[PDB]
């Protein structure tokens, strides 16, 4: 599923991400936009053999199991395929653990380089929330 900007914002809000760990909703929508262009099915391979999955490009090196990332962790306790669902619950639940692991949203490289320090509030303009 390719979410619309405001549709995503609402699903994210619903799932408790607005201000999760002090990160306003515009942060999460901006991260999604640049990580996967709002596509739940996005997948990208890393040079170490690990793979990033879904709307928030969660890395199999640490957060999910894809049975093809030798000696990696499965911190969210889920198969990586669960992160490609049209339903973002798994993605959001796992994101919540990631953001609290010490580095905040710096865990998301697109967030750090394209969202961090910008006017993220623009990402939720005109949405009924």
Ligand X SMILES: CC(=O)N[C@@H]1[C@@H](O)[C@H](O[C@@H]2O[C@H](CO)[C@@H](O[C@@H]3O[C@H](CO)[C@@H](O[C@@H]4O[C@H](CO)[C@@H](O)[C@H](O)[C@H]4NC(C)=O)[C@H](O)[C@H]3NC(C)=O)[C@H](O)[C@H]2NC(C)=O)[C@@H](CO)O[C@H]1O
Determine phi and psi for 23, rounding to 5 degrees: -105, 110
**Under 8 Å between Cβ of 64 and 78:** yes
**Under 8 Å between Cβ of 8 and 29:** yes
Q: Is 87 annotated as a binding residue?
A: no
Q: How far is the CB of 99 from ligand X (least distance, A)?
A: 9
Q: Is 66 a catalytic residue?
A: no
**Under 8 Å between Cβ of 88 and 15:** yes
Helix (H) or strand (E) holding 25: helix 25-36
* Position among 19, 77, 103, 118 found at the interface with ligand X (CB under 6 A): 103
* Position among 55, 88, 92, 98 found at the interface with ligand X (CB under 6 A): 98
Q: State the number of binding residues for ligand X (CB under 6 A).
A: 17
Q: Which stretch binds ligand X (CB under 6 A): 1-9, 14-22, 54-62, 78-86?
A: 54-62
Catalytic residue among 7, 18, 48, 52: 52
Q: Is 108 in the site for ligand X (CB under 6 A)?
A: yes
Catalytic residue among 7, 18, 35, 87: 35
Question: Cα 114 to the chain's mean position, in Å?
Answer: 14
Q: Is 7 a catalytic residue?
A: no
d(CA 58, CA 48): 15
Please report, as ranges, the residues that interact with ligand X according to CB under 6 A: 35, 44, 46, 52, 57-59, 61-63, 98, 101-103, 107-109
């Amino acid at each position: 599923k390719v979410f619309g900007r405001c549709e995503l914002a609402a699903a994210m809000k619903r799932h408790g991400l607005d201000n999760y760990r002090g990160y306003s909703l515009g942060n999460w929508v901006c991260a999604a936009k640049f990580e996967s262009n709002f596509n739940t099915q996005a997948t990208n391979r890393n040079t170490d053999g690990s793979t990033d999955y879904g709307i928030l490009q969660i890395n199999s090196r640490w957060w999910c199991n894809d049975g093809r990332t030798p000696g990696s962790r499965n911190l969210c306790n889920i198969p990586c395929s669960a992160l490609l669902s049209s339903d973002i619950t798994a993605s959001v639940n796992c994101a919540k653990k990631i953001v609290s692991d010490g580095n905040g949203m710096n865990a998301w490289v697109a967030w750090r380089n394209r969202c961090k320090g910008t006017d993220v509030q623009a990402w939720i303009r005109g949405c009924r929330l």
